[PDB]
Write a protein that holds these residues in place. Structure first.
Motif, PDB file in Angstrom:
ATOM      1  N   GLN A 173      -9.580   0.704   4.897  1.00  0.00           N
ATOM      2  CA  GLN A 173      -8.556   0.595   3.715  1.00  0.00           C
ATOM      3  C   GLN A 173      -8.137  -0.992   3.634  1.00  0.00           C
ATOM      4  O   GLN A 173      -7.881  -1.432   2.679  1.00  0.00           O
ATOM      5  CB  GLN A 173      -7.528   1.489   4.131  1.00  0.00           C
ATOM      6  N   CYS A 174      -7.677  -1.408   4.991  1.00  0.00           N
ATOM      7  CA  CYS A 174      -7.486  -2.918   4.994  1.00  0.00           C
ATOM      8  C   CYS A 174      -9.056  -3.476   5.039  1.00  0.00           C
ATOM      9  O   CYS A 174      -8.967  -4.711   4.455  1.00  0.00           O
ATOM     10  CB  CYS A 174      -6.971  -3.330   6.345  1.00  0.00           C
ATOM     11  N   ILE A 196      -1.831  -2.793   8.883  1.00  0.00           N
ATOM     12  CA  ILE A 196      -2.087  -3.238   7.437  1.00  0.00           C
ATOM     13  C   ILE A 196      -2.498  -2.173   6.473  1.00  0.00           C
ATOM     14  O   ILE A 196      -1.712  -1.923   5.543  1.00  0.00           O
ATOM     15  CB  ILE A 196      -2.667  -4.743   7.365  1.00  0.00           C
ATOM     16  N   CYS A 197      -3.496  -1.526   6.910  1.00  0.00           N
ATOM     17  CA  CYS A 197      -3.789  -0.273   6.177  1.00  0.00           C
ATOM     18  C   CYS A 197      -2.936   0.655   6.736  1.00  0.00           C
ATOM     19  O   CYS A 197      -2.399   1.550   5.881  1.00  0.00           O
ATOM     20  CB  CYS A 197      -5.204   0.293   6.540  1.00  0.00           C
ATOM     21  N   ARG A 226       0.841  -1.145  -0.021  1.00  0.00           N
ATOM     22  CA  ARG A 226      -0.058   0.050   0.222  1.00  0.00           C
ATOM     23  C   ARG A 226       0.939   1.354   0.120  1.00  0.00           C
ATOM     24  O   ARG A 226       0.518   2.285  -0.571  1.00  0.00           O
ATOM     25  CB  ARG A 226      -0.924  -0.145   1.122  1.00  0.00           C
TER      26      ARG A 226
HETATM   27 ZN   LIG Z   1      -5.733  -0.816   4.415  1.00  0.00          ZN
END
Ligand SMILES: [Zn+2]
Ligand SMILES: [Zn+2]
Ligand SMILES: [Zn+2]
Ligand SMILES: [Zn+2]
Lengths: 433, 295, 385
Positions: free
Chosen positions: C284-285, C298-299, A360
């Motif tokens: 987002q995750c 993670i996000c 990301r």
């Molecule tokens: Zn995420």
């Protein structure tokens, strides 16, 4: 890198399945996992009783120098090592007499038995360190000359060559200076010994980050107890200006949130002929109407007896008293469906999140086309197949059954999707060659 | 054990209670408060120790309906503890004269409230927020009245009957978070419309929110639910379980968003349609706020 | 000589206005001994989303009693209170518990906002020997390298609990001025019952505020002084973006009980080693795990939960003040605008704008619990525009 993966079995259990399930390589393991803890996790073995040791251990080197005939070799620094970590040319001297005293254990006693008391003249090695420290102070003499300010060795000398005197001021000692010749010899060496210990800071101050300015006296020294310097200067209208515009924006847009706006004006519009006040007239009339109606309380004597409106009031009580038909036993396969995914796949998934967060991250800057590195634009490509393939057999192992599988795969496909989202979004900003 | 204090906040919107009369209802404001009065008396019927607090929301103010603010209780201030040596109102009591000790003082003061129909302050509607703390200071003093082997079990009732007003959103939220410090249950029955904001206040408390089934049918749930102790509800297994609550939009244009971003240090999280700061005339440091506009 | 002179110290103290009313004014001076520093606030500018760093001197100075049976007992007990009252006031932040012991520095609890983890760490920190000497250089090393990887849109402040001893560390910590002055990291120490000039020069070269512990009450004061997010140096940041608004999840939305537990090593979320049934959801995750109004792994964005933390400071700045008069304008029927009572200890507390009459127990309840005058309500919102 390999001692890191052996002394830590949890991260090794993480590091196993990238080799066991063949997720990524070791080259890829040390490329996107660590990268920050190379300063943080490696900050243990380097410091170790504050390295570049100058003024931390030097307070305690003399009291902890001896417990007994063999009270030595504690751990790593225990009680001998940081002695070596300050003297350099004297460390070369230690290396010189280890075969002179044969056994290193013998050296630990001999080399330090006679140097501790008064004076060490029994072996070439002990005499080497002894003579060197006089040269060290002779070497330390030259450095103090180069500073030469706030140093009354200069200021004293101007008053003694001028009459050719202050040799009698030296030679004027009372109290039986005739027949001892013991501590006169001794104490000046102990004076010298602790000035060595004093300059042992200086012998380790160079180890710090070489620590040099040597003081060209800076001829201002402005006695500033007055003046009111008042170092910090806030309050030049910074959050005063925010308050003037944001509450202004909290005024003109007071809570334009979900329910916070849309029900608000809609019922204010429902108030209708409120500037016309014809509803407000009837309001103020109904303010005047039931004005008297409350206080009498004969109307409000029997505003209770409606058991017609008890049954329905009992009803949605009883309706909400018994919800039914909603799979009371919802678990009881969850223990099997815990231990099988929380054996590998808790850690396996964590292999992704150590990487996929960075996946990301490079796309979190990529359309600016700045963080565009070949190290990263193919790291987009690298782990892409390294994760989205190695999950497929953990995906395909659980589709052994059908409804045992299709419940949990509603929640794993995000991992497939957040992969493919990133991949899908990667070409939404089309990259050139 | 303890003393078991009750707090009651009643909505009295005479705009809406006039509108309650505009339908020519089978449940009026006269029918409203009398239930709420005996509801306050019902509190007293569990124990002599029980104490009450009642405050409606007038368009200009919120006067303490209970205990009082006039020469019937400005010199009386209740019989148990620190006595006024007052004979007539200090004489008759025991489950029925205590209520007419307090029946009078509400209907006389709502008379003082319903004589002020002269609003010209641009529809100054339901002023719940400042009305809330009027209890909270008083019970702080009542905390300081006696505490010596005297746990103050306060319990806050909020009654809603109309829409919320246009009050300051911060000054909406904060006192609940101050009540979050205060460790006192707050419970809410609404009548007409739902308040997503005030049901969030319930969620802060873990209290109880209630949409009424019907306004004349507000005498049995009000009996069962809005009924004290946190003992009667942590043991009485009947909780309105619903509390569907999505929230979290932003303030520049209008949205319902999962991603926010602050505009300056001032805690101003706006909609994405925002070039230059509308939180101030201080410009945004140009590294980050176009990254909200970059990806 | 001294047998008289030991009791010439008692001669005056014991004696007072005699005849009648004895041992009376001695009690009056004890009330006259009271009433120490109130607020002296009124600031603007900075203070938002701090990233604190607990630094603890663990030394032989702890073995002196001086306030408690241990100076850690003075220290550690009220840190938990300082933790909780921080998370009360400032949930938009997080704190690095880092412990110096034996001339090194152990980052004991990481930079985080989970209170139980921090408090049980202090409950673990009870039986600390505090062997060895303080080393701040190892502490600043962790403080650098951790906060080095934090954004420049982060508030960068360090809270050092130092036991006033010799700053036993090499490697030119005087040159760590220009290290950290450039690194825009603030460092605040308070001395335990004494002063370290070099550390006093350090903080005055920092902009971090240095103090000396006087007493246990006084210990609380400076904690309380440092509860508030201070206006640090200018040119830190403006904004901080991708504040993730989450969802609560009920796990009963459409498919009733289709999942026995919402943590089975494949679900988006399920971050911590424990079973869960679905309570939360990040944008987002799309991370569903145990509810947390902070951030994720993670996000990697900020799990903002607005009614909590976008509300806390959101009224902690815009305060005003009252005034005090001893006079008698008898507003009410000799009442209070708040609690409605009277004692008249000549502290008739009048607002600056709406000008309403309050008591100490109404002033304190504002100035510690309510933080605003509700008399401004009914007075602000009715002509507001
Ligand atoms: Zn995420
Ligand atoms: Zn802003
Ligand atoms: Zn007051
Ligand atoms: Zn006010």
């Amino acid at each position: 890198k390999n001692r890191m993966l052996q002394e830590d079995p949890v991260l090794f259990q993480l590091y196993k399945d990238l080799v066991v399930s063949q997720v990524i390589s070791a080259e890829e393991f040390w490329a996107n996992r660590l990268n920050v803890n190379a300063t943080d996790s490696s900050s243990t073995s380097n410091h170790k009783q504050d390295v570049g040791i100058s003024a931390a251990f030097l307070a305690d080197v003399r009291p902890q120098t001896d417990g007994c005939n063999g009270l030595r070799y504690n751990l790593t620094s225990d009680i001998i090592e940081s002695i070596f970590r300050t003297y350099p040319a004297v460390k070369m001297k230690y290396a010189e007499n280890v075969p002179h005293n044969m056994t290193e254990k013998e050296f630990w006693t001999r080399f330090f038995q006679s140097h501790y008391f008064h004076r060490d003249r029994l072996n070439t090695g002990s005499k080497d360190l002894f003579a060197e420290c006089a040269k060290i102070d002779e070497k330390g003499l030259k450095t103090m000359v180069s500073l030469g300010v706030k140093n009354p060795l200069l200021d004293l000398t101007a008053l003694e060559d001028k009459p050719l005197d202050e040799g009698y001021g030296i030679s004027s000692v009372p109290s039986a200076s005739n027949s001892k010749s013991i501590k006169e010899n001794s104490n000046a060496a102990i004076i010298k010994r602790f000035n060595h210990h004093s300059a042992m800071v200086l012998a380790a101050g160079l180890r710090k980050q070489e620590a040099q300015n040597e003081q060209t006296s800076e001829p201002s020294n402005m006695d500033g107890n007055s003046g009111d310097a008042d170092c910090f200067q806030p309050a030049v209208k910074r959050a005063k200006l925010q308050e003037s515009i944001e509450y202004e924006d909290l005024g003109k847009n007071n809570s334009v949130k979900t329910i916070a706006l849309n029900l608000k004006k809609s019922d204010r519009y429902y108030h209708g002929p409120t500037p016309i006040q014809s509803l407000q007239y009837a309001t103020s009339q109904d303010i005047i109407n039931s004005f008297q109606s409350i206080r009498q309380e004969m109307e409000a004597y029997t505003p209770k007896l409606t058991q017609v409106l008890s049954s329905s009031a009992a009803s949605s009580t009883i309706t909400a008293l018994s919800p039914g038909g909603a799979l009371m036993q919802g678990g009881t396969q969850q223990a099997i469906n815990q231990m099988v995914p929380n054996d590998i796949q808790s850690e396996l998934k964590h292999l992704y999140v150590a990487v996929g967060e960075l996946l990301r991250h490079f796309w979190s800057c990529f359309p600016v086309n700045t963080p565009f590195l070949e190290e990263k634009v193919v790291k987009m490509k690298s782990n892409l197949e390294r994760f989205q393939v190695t999950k497929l057999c953990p995906f395909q192992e659980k589709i052994r059954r059908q409804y045992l599988s299709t419940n949990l795969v509603s929640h794993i496909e995000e991992m497939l999707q957040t992969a493919y989202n990133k991949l899908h979004t990667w070409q939404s900003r089309r990259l050139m060659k | 054990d303890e003393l078991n204090l009750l707090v009651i906040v009643v909505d009295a919107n005479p705009i809406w209670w006039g509108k309650q009369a505009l339908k020519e209802s089978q449940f009026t404001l006269s029918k409203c408060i009398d239930a709420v009065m005996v509801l306050g008396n019902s509190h007293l019927f569990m124990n002599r120790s029980n104490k009450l607090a009642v405050i409606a929301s007038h368009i200009q103010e919120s006067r303490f309906l209970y205990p009082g603010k006039n020469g019937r209780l400005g010199d009386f201030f209740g019989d148990p503890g620190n006595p006024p040596e007052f004979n007539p109102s200090g004489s008759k009591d025991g489950k029925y004269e205590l209520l007419t000790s307090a029946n009078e003082v509400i209907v006389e003061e709502i008379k003082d409230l319903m004589t002020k129909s002269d609003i010209k302050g641009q529809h100054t509607e339901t002023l719940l927020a400042g009305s809330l703390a009027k209890a909270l200071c008083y019970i702080h003093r009542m905390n300081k009245e006696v505490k010596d082997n005297q746990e103050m079990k306060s319990r806050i009732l909020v009654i809603k009957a109309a829409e919320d007003s246009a009050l300051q959103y911060m000054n909406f939220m904060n006192v609940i978070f101050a009540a979050q410090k205060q460790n006192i249950l707050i419970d809410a029955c609404v009548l007409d419309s739902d308040s997503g904001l005030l049901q969030q206040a319930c969620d802060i408390t873990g209290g109880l929110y209630l949409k009424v089934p019907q306004m004349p049918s507000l005498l049995q749930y009000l009996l069962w639910v809005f009924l004290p102790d946190q003992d009667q509800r942590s043991q009485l297994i009947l909780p309105p379980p619903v509390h569907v609550d999505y929230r979290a939009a932003c303030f520049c244009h209008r949205n319902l968003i999962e991603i926010g971003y602050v505009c300056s240090v001032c805690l101003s999280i706006f909609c994405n349609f925002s070039p230059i700061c509308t939180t101030c005339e201080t410009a945004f440091k140009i590294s980050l706020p176009p990254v909200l506009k970059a990806k | 000589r001294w047998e008289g002179g030991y009791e010439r110290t008692w001669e005056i103290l014991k004696e007072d206005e005699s005849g009648s009313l004895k041992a009376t004014i001695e009690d009056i001076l004890f009330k006259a001994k009271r009433k120490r520093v109130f607020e002296h606030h009124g600031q603007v500018r900075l203070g938002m989303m701090r990233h604190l760093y607990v630094v603890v001197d663990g030394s032989r100075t702890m073995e002196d009693q001086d306030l408690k049976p241990n100076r850690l007992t003075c220290t550690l007990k009220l840190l938990e209170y300082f933790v909780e009252e921080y998370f009360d006031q400032n949930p938009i932040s997080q704190i690095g518990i880092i412990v110096t012991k034996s001339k090194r520095a152990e980052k004991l609890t990481e930079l985080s906002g989970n209170p139980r983890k921090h408090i049980t760490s202090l409950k673990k920190a009870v039986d600390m020997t505090c062997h060895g000497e303080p080393s701040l250089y190892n502490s600043l090393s962790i403080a650098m390298q951790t906060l080095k990887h934090m954004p420049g849109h982060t508030s960068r402040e360090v809270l050092i609990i130092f036991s006033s001893l010799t700053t036993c560390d090499p490697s030119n910590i005087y040159d760590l001025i220009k290290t950290l002055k450039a690194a825009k990291i603030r460092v605040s120490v308070i001395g335990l019952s004494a002063e370290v000039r070099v550390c006093t020069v350090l903080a005055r070269e920092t902009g971090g505020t240095y103090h000396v512990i006087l007493d246990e009450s006084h210990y609380k004061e400076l904690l309380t002084h440092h509860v508030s997010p201070p206006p640090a140096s200018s040119s830190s940041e403006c904004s901080l973006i991708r504040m993730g608004f989450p969802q609560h999840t009920i796990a009963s939305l459409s498919d009733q009980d289709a999942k026995p537990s919402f943590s089975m090593a494949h679900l988006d979320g399920n971050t911590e080693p424990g079973l869960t049934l679905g309570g939360y959801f990040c944008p987002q995750c799309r991370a569903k795990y145990c509810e947390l109004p902070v951030e994720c792994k993670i996000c990697g964005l900020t799990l903002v939960s607005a009614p909590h933390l976008a509300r806390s400071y959101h009224h902690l700045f815009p305060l005003d003040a009252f005034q005090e008069i001893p006079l008698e304008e008898y507003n009410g029927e000799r009442f209070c605008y708040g609690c409605q009572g009277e004692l008249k200890d000549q502290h008739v507390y009048v607002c600056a704008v709406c000008q309403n009459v309050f008591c100490v127990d109404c002033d304190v309840f504002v100035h510690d619990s309510l933080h605003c005058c509700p008399g401004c309500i009914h007075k602000i919102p009715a002509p507001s525009g």
